[PDB]
RNA sequence: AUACUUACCUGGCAGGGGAGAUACCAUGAUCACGAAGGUGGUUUUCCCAGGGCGAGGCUUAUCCAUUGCACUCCGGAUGUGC
């Protein structure tokens, strides 16, 4: 709930393959700012979710505001802030601890 | 039912993966203790020459469950071709 460099997106159609989904997520989410990375996994816990890491929290917040509910493969997108900083964020800040 | 002598009718020979290394067995080698090699084994490296074990791994659909906060690949089962 507290703004973050990374946004977390879930409730995605699970049929889409990892590389396809990363590609289309990059395409969809670049409109709001420079994206450093999009992390997707299809494991049991992680399937259906992606982390988009933006350079600025303001871009993250605006992407959340705009895309909240966006029709995506016949499903409304659910977006939250990441609970924790993404490793590449934490290393740029020097906050990272194993 | 068997063997013996004769006539007639049928029919192609050799074999059992191959090349190296064998200190050890057999051949108990015809000259005052002896062969080597070779031949037939046992041991030991390969072109892998065919098979058995299908663990592991690759490609893609079906079924069940998951709303999951990860950043060292990886949910369970069935089918097709390797």
If you had to describe this structure to a student in words, what would you say it looks like?
The protein is of the alpha+beta class and 98 residues long. The protein has one domain (1-98). The protein is built from three helices and four strands; from the N terminus they run E-H-E-E-H-E-H. It has helices at residues 18-29, 57-67, 87-93, and strands spanning 6-10, 35-41, 49-54, 78-81. A four-stranded antiparallel beta sheet has the order 2-3-1-4, covered by helices on one side. Strand 2 (35-41) and strand 3 form a beta hairpin. The longest helix is centred in the first third of the chain and has 12 residues, at 18-29. It is globular and about 40 Å long. It binds one RNA strand of 82 nucleotides through strand 1 and strand 2. Residues 5-84 form the RRM domain. This is U1 small nuclear ribonucleoprotein A. Its main location: nucleus. Belongs to the RRM U1 A/B'' family. It is found in: Nucleus.
| Category by helix and strand content | alpha+beta
Number of DSSP helical runs: 3
Strand order of the largest sheet: 2-3-1-4
Taken from the alpha-carbon principal axes, the silhouette is globular
Instruction: Sketch the topology as an H/E string, one letter per element.
Output: EHEEHEH
Secondary structure tally: strands: 4
- N-end to C-end Cα span: 23 Å
Oligomer: part of a larger assembly
Largest sheet: 4 strands, antiparallel
Radius of gyration of CA atoms, rounded to a whole number:
13 Å
